[PDB]
């Protein structure tokens, strides 16, 4: 019926699958909620933090 969107993440730690600490490979919102955001492992791409830093 419907598909849920994909949320952007910017890394802070080496993914054992795809990304080494700095890539912008966007995966899933639930993979950010349950796994990446509590473990200090990814962040949300915001223009206030990415563009000026």
């Amino acid at each position: 019926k419907k598909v849920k969107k994909i949320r952007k993440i910017i890394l802070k730690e080496d993914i054992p699958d795809l990304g080494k600490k700095g890539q912008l490979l966007d995966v899933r919102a639930g993979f950010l909620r349950n796994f990446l955001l509590p473990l200090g492992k990814a962040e949300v791409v915001t223009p206030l933090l990415l563009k000026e830093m």
Partner: protein, 74 residues
């Protein structure tokens, strides 16, 4: 109660209609489900009873402005 503390979503008094237009009551209520969401101002999980629209707020807007919008965080 079946209310979400962040967004004030309550149950819906909404009848159900059959083919012969017979109407019962069917109190219709939200999917405010048990979760345990990470909190950045303490770096720790909080156990909450969240509606899914409020889930979309605390992932979209962040838990700080939503929890201060409700007024409670502890």
């Amino acid at each position: 109660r079946r209310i979400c503390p962040f967004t004030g979503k309550k149950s819906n008094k909404a009848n159900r209609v059959s083919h012969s237009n017979h109407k019962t009551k069917r109190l219709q209520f939200v999917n405010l489900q048990y979760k345990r969401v990470w909190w950045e101002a303490g770096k720790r999980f909080v156990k909450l009873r969240l509606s899914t629209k409020a889930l979309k707020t605390i992932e979209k807007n962040g838990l700080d402005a939503v929890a201060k919008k409700a007024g409670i965080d502890l």
